[PDB]
Structure formats: structure tokens, C-alpha cells
């Protein structure tokens, strides 16, 4: 199981984004495709030696080399492929290009972690369930100042002013700041609701044909 | 008897709105209570001679006469109740005020007919199911430019031209261009989806004791 380094990326529902790095330009396009551009520069003029295009489900990867290796002066929006392309499915992807694509796979998993899937306004706070499921991040916005970030492990807490604390497990510090304990207990409720709503709405979306059921915005600003 | 003619109004989930007029000021407060204030003009300044306030569920009615010389000075918010006040249940409301509760019932029913409960974005249109249940109004604004307005009695098409006409019955809509039925059927499918979406969500809401699961905005305008 060589593929178990990472599961194929999922760029669905995500808005277009572009992240430039010293050696790569990761870009989510409209049509929800991910582009890894191996960059390089001569005399302060950047260009692209290599380009990787990946489907929105991460199963198919297209590899081509712009200008036949001569490369093309850096553009903000990645160039179209020629007739000269090489393409692979996810499994039978050659041994190389694994620093690449995975590089994108971890970039997509990050944009998902900041992309709101479900927004729930309460009488108190504003709950947000991110798109990076299974480990879907949960942010809670009380406008009084407090905040909670549920995630893989570190449930984070923010005092109302620019103040802050932290937390790891679910046996001890869940019994701390009890006058503030009412927030974790409150957030876990909203987390339970936003998870239940994702579940039941996803099933109705699975039955039928039409437009995506996500993201959604529940309730109004108080 | 009142309740011969009318059923207790429902102003839940409605947005705060105030409406001046030559006679009275009818409004919906932040607590979703319906307030009806009779207004009289004297010395180039307006005076309030009676205030009806109806509960959010329309079951409880409070009526107070701040009986005094010059009545009450008209402001931008409903005045604080005096001491010569009253409170009745819907069924125990006197024969008086019946003309005024019916007016307030129409006001609310009008507001709900223009209050989005579910907003759904398809590939071709923006779909909105309103708050006046049962048989709420359904409005479809195609990005194409065509507008469709569904009522329990009517169907109303506004072509890109601006050419507008109403189709009442099943035979009337069948007298069609076999191209506009696409707009008709896509809207009807969107209506089907929203009615389905509303049901499974409001079902989960009865299961809960939390902030309202409405209004909802599903998907995004592409």
C-alpha cells in the first residue's frame, strides 16, 4: 500500500486560492483543480520547469513540461497543457512526483481546515464547522471575546481580550475555569448539532441530482 | 367569535420592522412580539391613544391605555406600559379589538410571505422558500433573468423581456412554449428540494431545544 502516504486530495467546494513558495506555486482553480508549479528563476525573472494538474477528486494527475523544458516566464494563472502530456491515475502514479501532489494534498487539507462548511448562529455565539472532515475543525465566535478551536487534539480557549490559554486531553482541564466550563459544554453541543446537520443533509444530497448542499448558513446574526 | 374568522398569528423568526402610517404604527420588535399603536395628531405633533401587543405565538394579548391628556408622545420604539393595562388569552379577547387583531394578523402574514426560510442556489437560479407556511410562496430568480413566482393558487412567470403573465391552473401552464417548461420544471424541482430540505431539518429541530434552524442559505451564487 504505497498510496498510504496520503489519501487522494479533495478540492470540491473550495474557492480558488494561490500560494507561492520558493520552489512551488500551489493553486486551486475554478473547476476545483489543483496545480503544482515547480518554479525557478534566472536574473530575477521567474518561470516554470514543471506543472502538475490534479483533478478535484485527486484520482487523476496530469504532468507536462511547458515550452518543452525551456519553461515559461512566471504567470499568476498557470499555463495550458500542450499535446505533449503524461497522465496517471492515483495508484499507478510513478515513484517520483510524490514530494509533489502530496505537497498539494497537504495544502488542500489546509484550505479545507479554513473553509466553513456549516455556520450556526446561536443566541450567544457563532459556530463554524470546517470542511476538513473527518478531523473537521470547529470554531466558535462569541462576540464578547471568547473563542474555542476544536480539532485533532488541542482544544484551544481564548480569553475575551487578546488573552489566551490552551488544552490537550479530555479528562483534566475540562474541569478548569468552570465559570468558563460552560463554553466547552456549549461548544460541544453546537459541535454535536453541526455534525448531526451535516449527516442528515449529506444523505438527502446523496439521494438526488441537483446542486451542492454545502456550504450552509444557519440562523442570523444577533 | 374571534377564532371563527382567524387563527393566532405566528411571528417567530421574523426580522424587526417598523411601519409608520397616517393612522397607526404597526411593528415587529426584537423579541418578535407584534406591536400595534394607534396614533392621533395634535398641535402639529403625534399622540398615541392605544397600544396592542401580541405574543410571538399570538396567544397572549396585552392592551394598555396610557390614558392621560395628550395621550402618548410618538417615538421610534413602543412606549413602556402604564398601570391601567390589560392582558387576555387569544380566546378570551373581548369583542372589541377584533378588528385590530385581524389587521395585525394580515400584517404578519404579509411579512412572512416576504421572509426567506430556505435559500437554495442551483446551477441556473436562486431559489427561495418563504415563511408563510403551510403552502409558502416560492420565488425563483434565474441568473438567466427569468423570474418565477409560485403561490398555492398561482404560478407567475416574468420572462427576460419583462413580458409578464400569470398561469393559474394545470391546463393553463400546459398551454406553453416547450422551452419555458424547463424553467417551470427546474423551479418545480427546486421547490421539491426545498420542501424536502425543510422537512428533515425542522424534524431535527423538534428533536432539539436550541436556536432556530432557520433561515438557511444553501450553496453559493456562482
Amino acid at each position: 500500500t504505497l498510496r498510504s502516504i496520503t489519501s487522494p486530495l479533495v478540492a470540491h467546494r473550495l474557492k480558488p486560492i494561490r500560494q507561492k513558495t520558493k520552489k512551488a506555486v500551489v493553486s486551486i482553480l475554478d473547476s476545483e483543480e489543483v496545480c503544482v508549479e515547480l518554479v525557478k528563476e534566472y536574473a530575477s525573472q521567474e518561470y516554470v520547469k514543471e506543472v502538475l494538474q490534479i483533478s478535484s477528486d485527486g484520482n487523476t494527475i496530469t504532468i507536462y513540461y511547458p515550452n518543452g523544458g525551456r519553461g515559461f516566464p512566471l504567470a499568476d494563472r498557470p499555463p495550458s497543457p500542450t499535446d505533449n502530456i503524461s497522465r496517471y491515475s492515483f495508484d499507478n502514479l510513478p515513484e517520483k512526483y510524490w514530494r509533489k501532489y502530496q505537497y498539494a494534498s497537504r495544502f488542500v487539507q489546509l484550505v479545507r481546515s479554513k473553509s466553513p462548511k456549516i455556520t450556526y448562529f446561536t443566541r450567544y455565539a457563532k459556530c463554524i464547522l470546517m470542511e476538513n472532515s473527518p478531523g473537521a475543525d470547529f470554531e466558535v465566535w462569541f462576540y464578547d471575546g471568547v473563542k474555542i478551536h476544536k480539532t485533532e487534539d488541542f482544544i484551544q480557549v481564548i480569553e475575551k481580550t487578546g488573552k489566551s490559554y490552551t488544552l490537550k486531553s479530555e479528562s483534566e482541564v475540562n474541569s478548569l475555569k468552570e465559570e468558563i466550563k460552560m463554553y466547552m459544554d456549549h461548544a460541544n453541543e453546537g459541535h454535536r448539532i453541526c455534525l448531526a446537520l451535516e449527516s442528515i443533509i449529506s444523505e438527502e444530497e446523496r439521494k438526488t441530482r441537483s446542486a451542492p448542499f454545502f456550504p450552509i448558513i444557519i440562523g442570523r446574526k444577533p | 367569535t374571534l377564532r371563527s374568522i382567524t387563527s393566532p398569528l405566528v411571528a417567530h423568526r421574523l426580522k424587526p420592522i417598523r411601519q409608520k402610517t397616517k393612522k397607526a404604527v404597526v411593528s415587529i420588535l426584537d423579541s418578535e412580539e407584534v406591536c400595534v399603536e394607534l396614533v392621533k395628531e395634535y398641535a402639529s405633533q403625534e399622540y398615541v391613544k392605544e397600544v396592542l401587543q401580541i405574543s410571538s405565538d399570538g396567544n397572549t394579548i396585552t392592551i394598555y391605555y396610557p390614558n392621560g391628556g395628550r395621550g402618548f408622545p410618538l417615538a421610534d420604539r413602543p412606549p413602556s406600559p402604564t398601570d391601567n393595562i390589560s392582558r387576555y388569552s387569544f380566546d378570551n379577547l373581548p369583542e372589541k379589538y377584533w378588528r385590530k387583531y385581524q389587521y395585525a394578523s394580515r400584517f404578519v402574514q404579509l411579512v412572512r410571505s416576504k421572509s426567506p426560510k430556505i435559500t437554495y442556489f442551483t446551477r441556473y437560479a436562486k431559489c427561495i422558500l418563504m415563511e408563510n407556511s403551510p403552502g409558502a410562496d416560492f420565488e425563483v430568480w434565474f441568473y438567466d433573468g427569468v423570474k418565477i413566482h409560485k403561490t398555492e393558487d398561482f404560478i407567475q412567470v416574468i420572462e427576460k423581456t419583462g413580458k409578464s403573465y400569470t398561469l393559474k391552473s394545470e391546463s393553463e401552464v400546459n398551454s406553453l412554449k416547450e422551452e419555458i417548461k424547463m424553467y417551470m420544471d427546474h423551479a418545480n424541482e427546486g421547490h421539491r428540494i426545498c420542501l424536502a430540505l425543510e422537512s428533515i431539518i425542522s424534524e431535527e429541530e423538534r428533536k432539539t431545544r436550541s436556536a432556530p434552524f432557520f433561515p438557511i442559505i444553501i450553496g453559493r451564487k456562482p
Binding site: 448558513i217 | 394607534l38 378588528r99 389587521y103 394580515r106 400584517f107 404579509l110 416576504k114 436562486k126 430568480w141
Partner: protein
């Protein structure tokens, strides 16, 4: 990631205004004995 009132919204708010104006105001008339 959120927007405000579009055309659909303003048109709806205006139809409401017209509707609330067409509301019989002669039902708040008093003394029915």
C-alpha cells in the same frame, strides 16, 4: 465569504412595503358598539 442584499432582496423588501401600504388601514377604525 458572505454577501449582503442583492437585487432579489431589495425587490422583495420593496414588494413588502407596497403590500403593507395596501393593508386596509380602515380596520383600525374604532367604535363598533
Amino acid at each position: 465569504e458572505d454577501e449582503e442584499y442583492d437585487e432579489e432582496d431589495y425587490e422583495r423588501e420593496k414588494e413588502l412595503q407596497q403590500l403593507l401600504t395596501d393593508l386596509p388601514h380602515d380596520m383600525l377604525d374604532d367604535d363598533l358598539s
